[PDB]
Design a binder for this molecule. Structure first.
Ligand SMILES: Nc1ncnc2c1ncn2[C@@H]1O[C@H](COP(=O)(O)OP(=O)(O)NP(=O)(O)O)[C@@H](O)[C@H]1O
Ligand SMILES: Nc1ncnc2c1ncn2[C@@H]1O[C@H](COP(=O)(O)OP(=O)(O)NP(=O)(O)O)[C@@H](O)[C@H]1O
Ligand SMILES: [Mn+2]
Ligand SMILES: [Mn+2]
Ligand SMILES: [Mn+2]
Ligand SMILES: [Mn+2]
Lengths: 302, 302
């Protein structure tokens, strides 16, 4: 596998990409900043600029840098913290089209992306920025960066973002949910796992009484969802899932009560947000369903 | 004059336009919201919808409504306060291409606009929004609304915004400044006025020692300028002026000390921001000059 071959390009690349930035001084982000893409050549020899290596000659494309500085900033991600947990610490792979890696400290996920998807996102940024500065408590992904790598002719685009479910809290039940049902059962292979990543039906069978929620916690979530859904819909986006991580216990997550009655810290966040039909009311449709489901069935009041 | 003929269309129009909105419920603003433009027919009879009148049949175009709701909101402009001081209180005209009106309470200015200009601005919005949510203390105009009126075939576009120099503080000296000089003297006609609106040279002759500024006040202004200039520049914008209103005294404005030495509350804000070359470095040029001027010559430290 060209796996650890790539794992390198990333860590060498970012590190240079970000150290690069911390020279250039702070300045508000501008509509222009979004469309930019800065590339950097990595000779296996190494220039007096691009040095080190023994890995596999590649270019390292960095995307909309000033924006992702801004976003990190706004998501409170100190760069050395970023650079560190991300570049000086082996990226551990992951089974789940779409290859996921993880920070050695379970902080950060990396996805790859269909070039269609990167390009979409490039466009999304402004829309993101807006939401971000308005629903401070939105559920959408926290995109810390977008970058691409060149394996000879082959091109790999990737996005770095918040692992929603850090090891730090041991999650008991884990559902990926959609408000849909066809194939929405966790395949056999998946269920042979510790805490496995279930799905709509699994949740419907295994939990039909609900996730109970102290009135005012339900509310926030609900509106906050309905806001995200209104955004997402606006970009003709589909296939998004609410990833939920329930934790029975006997400080980052949401409080809840059980079918039985244990106190619960629950963790959630919408994902898989880059496939957009960029029919006319279809995305509108998939948003209301997601809503009515999560807000009526998955979570419920008192 | 079709003046008071127009003064009506505005006050009848907005009022309907805004009352209209306060039905539709709150929701975050979205990239789409900017491009929208809602029109409303005003028969001199009046529908059961558009009623009243005896003034002159017209349509009332409203621009990017949800954004200007959002902006007002963010500039802290309660609508009834808006609607009131603006619609239920005679708009007083003003001598100064470009017709200015004023709120009966000196809160709000109205300009007209070259359709080129409206169209530019329509595009600017996103860029505005960004700046706005980052330089909270920016100097750019506070655009409370954009609207247009139809006089038969004739079309009038207008923008409502913050009077920078309310009667509430009596301004002694008043300069419109640019960091340029050709014709930058206040014409004779102008000087025959109470406090008149001077200009670069007038300021250079009448005040050459400066406007003195307690270190940390100078700083903010300076960066805040340099931010605005970096925005403005990005939109290939030109002819903008820093409007200054100095007030000798013996709570909204800036503190300062004199050539002599009186305490001073100074009021400022960049204007005339809609003419953009939308040469290649020219706007960049006009920004640095504006900067170096206001920051070296017009204001200076200690
Ligand atoms: N931010 C995240 N935090 C934790 N786990 C994640 C995150 N993103 C993805 N995953 C895991 O990977 C699964 C989702 O992959 P997904 O993001 O839906 O990409 P995909 O490959 O397009 N799958 P599909 O829904 O068929 O399109 C989830 O069920 C999670 O368990
Ligand atoms: N927000 C404001 N507050 C107070 N006065 C204003 C404001 N905007 C404009 N004015 C007054 O009107 C003058 C500027 O008109 P301006 O906005 O420059 O439009 P213009 O008609 O394009 N003039 P020009 O600079 O030749 O293009 C200023 O010197 C002010 O005295
Ligand atoms: Mn998915
Ligand atoms: Mn997907
Ligand atoms: Mn001007
Ligand atoms: Mn002008």
């Amino acid at each position: 596998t060209t796996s650890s071959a790539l794992k390198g390009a990333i860590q060498l690349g970012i590190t240079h990409s970000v150290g690069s930035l911390s020279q250039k001084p702070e300045r508000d982000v501008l509509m222009q900043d979004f469309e930019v893409v800065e590339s950097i050549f990595f000779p296996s020899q190494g220039s007096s600029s691009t040095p080190g290596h023994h890995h596999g000659d590649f270019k390292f494309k960095t995307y909309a840098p000033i924006a992702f500085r801004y976003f990190r900033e706004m998501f409170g991600i100190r760069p050395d913290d970023y650079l560190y947990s991300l570049c000086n610490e082996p990226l551990i792979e992951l089974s789940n089209g779409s290859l996921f890696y993880v920070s050695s400290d379970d902080e950060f996920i990396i996805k790859t992306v269909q070039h269609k998807e990167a390009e979409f996102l490039q466009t999304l940024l402004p829309g993101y920025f807006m939401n971000l500065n308005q629903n401070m408590r939105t559920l959408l992904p926290k995109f810390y960066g977008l970058y691409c790598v060149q394996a000879d002719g082959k091109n790999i685009r990737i996005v770095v973002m918040n692992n929603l479910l850090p090891r730090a809290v041991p999650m008991h039940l884990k559902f990926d949910l959609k408000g849909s049902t066809y194939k929405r059962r966790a395949s056999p292979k998946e269920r042979s796992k510790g805490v496995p990543t279930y799905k709509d039906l699994d949740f419907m069978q295994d939990m039909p009484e609900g996730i109970l929620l102290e009135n005012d916690h339900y509310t926030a979530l609900s509106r906050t969802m309905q806001r995200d859904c209104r955004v997402l819909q606006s970009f003709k986006i589909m296939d998004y899932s609410l990833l939920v991580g329930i934790h029975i216990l006997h400080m980052g997550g949401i409080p809840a009560f059980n079918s039985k009655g244990e106190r619960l810290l629950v963790f959630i966040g919408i994902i898989d947000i880059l496939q957009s039909y960029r029919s006319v009311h279809r995305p509108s449709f998939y948003a209301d369903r997601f809503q009515k489901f999560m807000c009526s069935t998955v979570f419920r009041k008192s």
